[PDB]
């Protein structure tokens, strides 16, 4: 069969989104909106989340689509993935993103690339990135020098024990983050947690 593309629809914050899907052509998990992403698109919709003027990046993005919300909002964007996504990617940015949003696309393969990233983003975004186990000391190594010391990290999952997503985020992710659950989706089973670096306490 032809490679094809699919296109879904969202209305987030009243900006339209139409994310396009790119299917048979190797993109694999990549080419697929999941449902943490719809989860945490809500989330910055219901809570007001201000990304104005913000230095924002997105780790594996996939599509696109969180990012390019966090740039219809007003943030200064970086949106990364690996090589493989970056086409789909451009294409859901110039799709999406209007002549005054700030959307750049570059890729970051975690813990090989993050020194090719500045230190000093305000906000880290990542939805539907803990899966692969293996990856897990590479993420956490990107988060801690992506953030910022007074930035902000949110990701947001589907739980699935058997990925590792309970290692993370109640082992290994602790350790150096002071990590909120921002909030818990019951219908979807997605978290979204937040996390600042984790600060000595003064007593
Ligand atoms: N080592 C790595 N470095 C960078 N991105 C990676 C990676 N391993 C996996 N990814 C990316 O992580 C994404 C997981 S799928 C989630 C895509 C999107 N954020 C969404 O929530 O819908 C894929 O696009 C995949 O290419």
């Known amino acids: 069969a032809d490679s094809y593309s699919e296109k879904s629809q969202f209305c987030f914050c009243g900006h339209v989104l139409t994310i396009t899907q ?5 993109l694999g998990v990549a080419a697929r909106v999941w449902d943490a992403a719809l989860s945490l698109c809500n989330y910055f919709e219901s809570q007001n989340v201000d990304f104005r003027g913000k230095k924002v990046i997105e780790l594996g993005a996939g599509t696109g689509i969180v990012g390019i919300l966090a740039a219809l909002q007003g943030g200064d964007v970086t949106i990364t993935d690996l090589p493989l996504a970056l086409e789909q990617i451009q294409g859901n940015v110039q799709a999406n993103v209007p002549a005054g949003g700030q ?3 570059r890729a970051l393969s975690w813990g090989i ?5 500045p ?9 539907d990135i803990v899966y692969l186990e293996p990856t897990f000391p590479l993420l956490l190594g990107t988060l801690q020098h992506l953030c910022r010391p007074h930035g902000t990290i949110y990701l947001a999952s589907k739980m699935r024990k058997e990925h590792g997503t309970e290692s993370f985020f109640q082992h290994l992710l602790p350790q150096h983050f002071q990590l909120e659950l921002a909030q818990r989706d019951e219908d979807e089973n997605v978290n979204i947690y937040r996390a600042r670096h984790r600060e000595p306490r003064p007593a």
């Open 22 to 26: 790119n299917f048979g052509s190797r």
């Open 103 to 105: 959307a750049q696309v």
């Open 113 to 117: 690339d993050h020194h090719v990233f």
């Open 119 to 127: 230190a000093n983003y305000d906000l880290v975004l990542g939805a």
